[PDB]
Each structure stands twice: as structure tokens, then as C-alpha cells.
Design a protein around this motif. Sequence first.
Motif: not given
Length: 331
Positions: A248-249, A252, A276-279, A301, A305-306
Motif C-alpha cells: 500500500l505504500g 497513505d 510507493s503504492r504498487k499496482r 483495492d 485500505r489503511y
Amino acid sequence: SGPVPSRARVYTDVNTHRPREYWDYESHVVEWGNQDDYQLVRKLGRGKYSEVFEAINITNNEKVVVKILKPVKKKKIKREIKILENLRGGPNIITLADIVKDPVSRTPALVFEHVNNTDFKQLYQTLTDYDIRFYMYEILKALDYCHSMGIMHRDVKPHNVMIDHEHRKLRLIDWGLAEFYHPGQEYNVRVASRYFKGPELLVDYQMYDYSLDMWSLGCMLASMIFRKEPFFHGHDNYDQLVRIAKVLGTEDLYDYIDKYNIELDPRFNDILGRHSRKRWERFVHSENQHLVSPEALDFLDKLLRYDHQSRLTAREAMEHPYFYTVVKDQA
Ligand SMILES: Fc1cc(F)c2[nH]ccc2c1
């Protein structure tokens, strides 16, 4: 000051509007039964809090699952029993059948409806991408129901999901970590299994709610569409948050600390780093692609989420396009 408070987006005051006895599991009196009614047949497996036997109710030659509790505090047994009785009859909820005592100790023992487990591992090389959607849907039914019943399961993971593949039946079992949601209550973070803990557990935000089950639903989802088990493979509660951050990187992650004013354990202040947030594409490969879809990646996705308040709700989950095919099929 200190941590900014939180409330569940849905099912918030559900408990406050039931009679006290419903959630006040501490004062609930246990209606015991006669262990003489059952004869243990064979052992089905072990567990953290229980050893699990197949048994026969000699009253009626009925097949049954007995689960001898490992000794916790009486108020934890009462909690598990209470919750099971509230959820009893709900969709894909394991049915509690009787309560007895191991005759050679006293350790209480829960008695459940029998569900054949299909091999939790042999059930992998046969899951089609429709299998997953369908069973994902069955689980969400169990989640919307208990949330809507004011209860967080708090230990969702594939081991605690029993599947009877031949008859497309699924039961969410082992409710020993569940709790009632109350607005403003602060809960123990040491709950759920490590690979499935929510970010809020790892940063130590105690005023969480149903949406933690939703984070775990996403860890199940990931591992199954990507065939990566576990998906967030942490060496401990600390690393587990590093493993999440790498996907998630950190940006966030730090927005989520910032907005809730969480005090980060200084231990982290050395190992989280910047990421970074990876796809999701990077976890797709030839061996797992037949299960990945834009529908499926979008929906993943929107769970992982945090910020627990921004994850899909169980009921929002069930309206996602990744289940359109399933929804129409039931009919
Ligand atoms: F924990 C339990 C529960 C039972 F119902 C039993 N019956 C015979 C042994 C036994 C043990």
C-alpha cells in the motif's frame, strides 16, 4: 491531545437499541446440557483454543461436532456462547447445538452442527474464478448478518471458514474472538491472526469496528486470486505492518496515522521507511491469471485500505460488480 475517536459507518447503534441482556454477555447464565448425550467418535483437528472432535448424539444417532474449549476466563466462554446464540439461524453461521462439560476435566465444550470440511488445501487446485466469487459471496452474507447483529467476528481467515464443496455450503466458524460493537469502546489489538491483522491493530488504534473483518476479507481475497499464501507474510506484528506498507505504500499509512493522531510505536520509526503504492498487476502471473479480473482487482483495492472507515462495508461489498454473475445466479 491523544487519539481521534471513530465510529462505525454502519450498524453503529444497533446494540444500544436491544435489551441489555443481548450484549451484556458477562451476566448471561449458561444453560448446560448432558455430555452423557454424546460419544466422541474421532478427532478432526487441533487449534489455538480448542481440540475438535466428531461426535454422535446418542439421543438420535445424529452426527455432530464437539469442540472442547481450552481454558480461558469464564467471561470469554460466556462471550462466545452468547454471540453464537444471537447469530443462530443466520446465513452461513455455524449453528450452536448444545453446551456440555468434558467429563474428565470440566473444560466446557461447545457442540455444533456437523459440516464436512472439503480439504482446505485440496480445495485450491479446483477453485475456478467463479468458485471464489461464489464463496466470497457466501462469506459476505455471514459478515453482513453479524455486523448487522452488532458483532465483529475479528478472526476471519480461511481456516475459520468451513466449506462443503459438494453442496456449495459454507459456515463461518470459531467465534471465540468475536465482540459486540459499541460506539466509543476501545478493544484489544491482540486479536485475529497475524497475517490477517488490520493496520489499525498493528498501529494500536483501539476504537475499531466491523471494518476490521473487511480488511481480513481482503487478505483472504488477495491470497486466493493471486495464489499467494499468505499475501502479507509478516515475521511478526511489527514486520506485518512493514509487509503491508510495501504494497500500500507509506504515504497513505502516514496520512492514516496523521488523521487519527495515532502515536506510532517508535520501533516503527526505524523500519517502515518510504514505499510507493504498487499496482496489483505486479502480483499477477501465468499461474494465477485465470482468477484475476479488473472486477476482482477493483474490489480488492476497495477493501485493503489503511483507513478502516473507507473500506467497503460487507453490504457494499455484496453490491460490487465482481459478484454480478453470482447475484443473478441465485434466483
Ligand atoms: F468435551 C467432551 C464433550 C462431550 F460431549 C463428551 N462426551 C464424551 C466425552 C466428551 C468430551
